Subunit: 632 residues, 2 copies
């Protein structure tokens, strides 16, 4: 059962959100390893892999390149350090784009089934978004039923994954003509998403593409296939199926788990499952079932991006971010955690085996040995959701109440700020915020996104960067676990305006919004690309000229690499708070942080310090203001 913890985690400085330390210590006293303990067990981590100068692409390896110059400078094949670093980064981009593309593909399948009248458990709820998106891609809407429009749109979207021509992706019709011309001159226009992923897997194959420039340019093309198509399709279809998010209020942090209620966690990414689970479990049938089993009711909380989806659409309380999933089971009050795929730590099974908690996997692509697999499908969605919630409610009597410790800490957060909601907040036009940017009332906008990584202090960089930006009158928007961190800290509560500078304070009180805008999940970074795209278009300007920046302060996933790359390729200066494994090559490092600005108009900037990164981002914003002839 219990395990010997070899190295203990100094808990008082491990995290920036209240409750994480208590639960790490509870795990220690129970002998349960978390991600921090295993990170400590991994150290020292291999320097060659950390710098990206180790390749395992063929059986003649593994090969190490010594950047000291002490030992070997070339692999068995002859690959230098530049080639190996660029290829490994290309495969990271491929994997992130692939994750987002499979997400989009599942939502496309459900949307097409609804267009044909097959999945009657799912609606076309935003017919306006459907018609406008169909018109944007060249589909006439008038004279047609909603479902026929949806059928034609679905046919085009299905084809985004594998169309055979060298014509650009259809969804690129959402990108401004300036970005279009930039990508055309650079030759990075994506053609079909799965083809881009497969071509990266081919280029990195031994003896194919050894040039860092071409490798990274195709990485740019693949990231664009992700952001402006795959993730974009995911967001647009999730809005069409479950509603475009509008501003609402909810609760954040692990204080949302209840003592006298069945606690059901929804963890993962695809809302096709989580929306059904939440609606079924907060239905009154399951409420009285839980009362029959000795509870006051059923409380469903969310974690990570599927939690963000249910938070933005239904107001479901979000319990925590990435590195907190384990900790949620260590509260001792989780009857069941329902997962689909992406960023589901396998360790959550181990942890769950020291309690009563059931780890329910539901998707054929997300298997974890030891879990209980109840496969979800669209046609019998409500029945599977009922069965799952029933299993959780029936496990409720097994909760070891003697080992329950839920941290009190709970925070209010205003979420649901899609681009449509933001434009509605401005009176239906972009003009007031544009005037605020031109005056200097708002210096700029910064999108903060990304994961958690135990190599940096938990959620510290997220919140510190957000604070330092909003205090300098910079409107902060963001997605993902950054948004979970900001919500748990209080940066999205109605009083968060207190920490903003004078101009941001005045405008947030003039529009009744917080100074930090939760724009949704990791695929909802596409929303950011729309927002900037609108701004740049309203000002007769490219995205690269906007006084704006992006940041991933604590990233860890290959999805984050794809997101940062397509931010750069979209022309936004993009900061990384975790050092990508590229420092083993000077050429690749300067391409990433320098040479690529001339090509597409954005670039990377590595800085693990949140305050330093805030100063650099603010200086870049001031530079873009000076280039725009604006006041500073």
């Amino acid at each position: 059962m219990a395990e010997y913890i070899k190295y203990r985690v100094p808990a008082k400085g491990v995290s920036a959100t209240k409750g994480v330390a208590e639960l790490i210590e509870k795990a220690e006293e129970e002998g349960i390893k978390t991600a921090w303990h295993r990170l400590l067990e991994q150290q020292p981590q291999c320097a060659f892999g950390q710098l990206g100068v180790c390749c395992r692409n063929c059986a003649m390896g593994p090969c190490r390149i010594d950047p000291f110059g002490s030992g070997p400078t070339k692999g068995v094949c002859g690959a230098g350090a530049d080639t190996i670093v660029a290829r490994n980064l290309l495969r990271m981009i491929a994997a992130g784009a692939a994750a987002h593309s499979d997400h989009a593909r599942d939502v496309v399948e459900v949307f097409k089934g609804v267009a044909e009248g097959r999945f009657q458990y799912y609606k076309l709820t935003d017919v306006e978004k459907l018609k406008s998106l169909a018109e944007t891609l060249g589909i006439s809407t008038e004279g047609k039923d909603e479902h026929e429009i949806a059928r034609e749109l679905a046919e085009v979207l299905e084809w985004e994954f594998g169309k055979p021509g060298d014509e650009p992706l259809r969804m690129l019709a959402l990108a401004p003509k300036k970005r279009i011309k930039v990508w055309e001159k650079a030759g990075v226009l994506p053609r079909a998403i799965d083809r881009e992923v497969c071509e990266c897997m081919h280029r990195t194959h031994i003896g194919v593409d050894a040039d860092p420039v071409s490798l990274l340019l195709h990485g740019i093309r693949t990231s664009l296939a992700d952001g402006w198509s795959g993730s974009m399709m995911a967001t647009y279809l999730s809005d069409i199926l479950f509603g475009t998010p509008k501003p609402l209020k909810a609760e954040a942090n692990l204080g949302v788990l209840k003592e006298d209620y069945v606690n059901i966690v929804v963890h993962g990414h695809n809302p096709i499952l989580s929306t059904k689970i939440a609606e079924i479990a907060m239905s009154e049938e399951m409420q009285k079932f839980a009362k029959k089993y000795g509870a006051k009711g059923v409380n469903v909380v969310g974690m990570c991006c599927t939690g963000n989806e249910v938070l933005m659409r239904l107001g479901v309380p979000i319990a925590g971010s990435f590195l907190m999933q384990e900790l949620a089971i260590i509260t001792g009050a989780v009857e069941a955690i329902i997962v689909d795929y992406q960023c589901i730590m396998p360790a959550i099974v181990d942890v769950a085996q020291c309690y009563h908690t059931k780890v329910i996997t539901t998707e054929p692509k997300g298997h974890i040995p030891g879990a209980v697999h109840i496969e979800f499908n669209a046609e019998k969605a409500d029945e599977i959701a009922k069965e799952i919630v029933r299993i959780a409610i029936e496990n409720y009597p097994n909760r070891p109440r003697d080992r329950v410790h839920i941290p009190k800490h709970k925070m209010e957060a205003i979420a649901g700020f899609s681009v449509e909601a933001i434009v509605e907040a401005l009176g239906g036009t972009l003009e007031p915020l544009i005037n605020a940017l031109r005056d200097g009332t708002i210096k700029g906008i910064v999108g903060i996104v990304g994961c958690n990584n135990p190599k940096v202090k938990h959620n510290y960089s997220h919140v510190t960067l957000a604070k330092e930006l909003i205090k300098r009158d910079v409107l902060v928007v963001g997605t993902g676990c950054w948004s979970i961190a900001a919500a748990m800290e209080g940066l999205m509560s109605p009083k968060a305006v207190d920490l903003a500078g004078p101009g941001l304070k005045k405008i947030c009180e003039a529009l009744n919004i917080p100074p930090c805008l939760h724009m949704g999940s990791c695929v909802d970074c596409s929303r950011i690309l729309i927002a900037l795209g609108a701004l740049a278009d309203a000002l007769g300007v490219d995205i690269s000229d906007l006084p704006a920046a992006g940041s991933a302060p604590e990233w860890m996933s290959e999805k984050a690499v794809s997101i940062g790359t397509y931010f750069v390729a979209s022309g936004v200066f993009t900061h990384l708070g975790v050092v990508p494994p590229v420092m083993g090559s000077q050429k690749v490092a300067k391409i990433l942080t320098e040479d690529v600005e001339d090509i597409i108009g954005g670039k990377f900037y590595v800085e693990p310090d949140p305050v330093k990164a805030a100063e650099t981002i603010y200086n870049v914003i001031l530079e873009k203001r000076k280039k725009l002839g604006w006041p500073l």
Copy 2:
């Protein structure tokens, strides 16, 4: 210029083909590093990577799993050794399938351009193959022009890469119904190739698929998308465009390079380029151009799989296999080496910079820094080929004749044994070879394929396994660098029958074929799958019941991993002569070499010794004979 060689390669036992030792020593005395020297510089290679128990799939890594049990047993995410090994192998399968799929995609593009009447430099030469393949996939041929049939076929083939349904790949119509039912029960039927590659990249993403069984089953599905579709399309369309190979004779080994002729090497994989280069350079215009430049003419030789393509179709002499590419430049007589993609050592540029040799890259996916890029396209194919051959001929005067050493060693080889050619050799029916298998005149058939790897003796396992099999009356067929090795040794010369056993000797003299059948390039392993598929179907039998085996004695590429996996999945016992990086996990090792036989009917078997592997393969063949009620 020259380099200090830190460790010298014992050349007298380095290889099994004559001439390799002399050229390794010439490289040493010139200070030019080959793959062997850099392999020596890499040792000791990291044990964790060698056993597959090191993962770099996220920024929380790199993570090592200690199979000793000394240190950490789980990664930061919680992934055990089984998960990490299975995921890394899945990405190898993804990369190999992707390489073969991009190859097929380029040939599909050219074939579709010819169907529309656009690339008039390319013909429909095998209209019979075109019509039969179109009928096999449900396209009626009668009443239609050749080009219209080709258009409909191309539409179906284009869709193999990205069709949106969960329906199986169309090309699976070439697989027997028994394999169909096996794959259906296992649930590994491939749907769309690029989707399979992208789904592997998604499953191996952090926190998605952690179960080794599901990971490896999707690897099986992806390998099937490669072998029975992508590689199959590549082979079928290459035959339709450039002719189905028929038996012919040619020369092998580095003795085919001439002293008084311009020497042009074609290296790579896609014949769209190499056929044009060979035809243009052996045209009389370039012959008199080379005479004007002081040479007797132009001699074009091939290396690796594109060399195998031009060898099977035109009789172009093949100069060597994988590990010999560098050595070909060290002869000092190569005016130009023309490469497209796949297994092009970047080091060949370095080596070429110590001579006059020009490394010409021609494909947008195959860039090598320092090379000269003359991009090839179908519409201006003949003009680009003329320009390239002219550059080689004009470089001829720069050959340092003082530093020229071409090994005399040259061997005759009978190549061009496609399935059609083999059936034509048997009188148009499969009955004589089936009778020979039933009698015991031929014990079985074994396909030998794969790469070269300097960790094992060069070409030694290829030739030794082929010899040990044919001496026990086992018909040896094979592709790729195994076929180059067999051709250079003499196992495909008319006298090779001398080394065969009595039954194989009698039947090869009765049909005037060698005991070793060159069936083409790495994609032409699809031919093998057809052959077995025919045999199994003629006997009313599954492929798994045939007295047959496959082997990759010296593999190194991820393409080889995909090929071996889809051989296994096709039901053939498949031997590996190089240990895959899986031994860090007992569960994955037993799935690969044991548990998977119950699922699909084949399995892996690791044995780096060629004689041991020959005995095991022969015993498995005898087992399959006993199960068939045949004599032993």
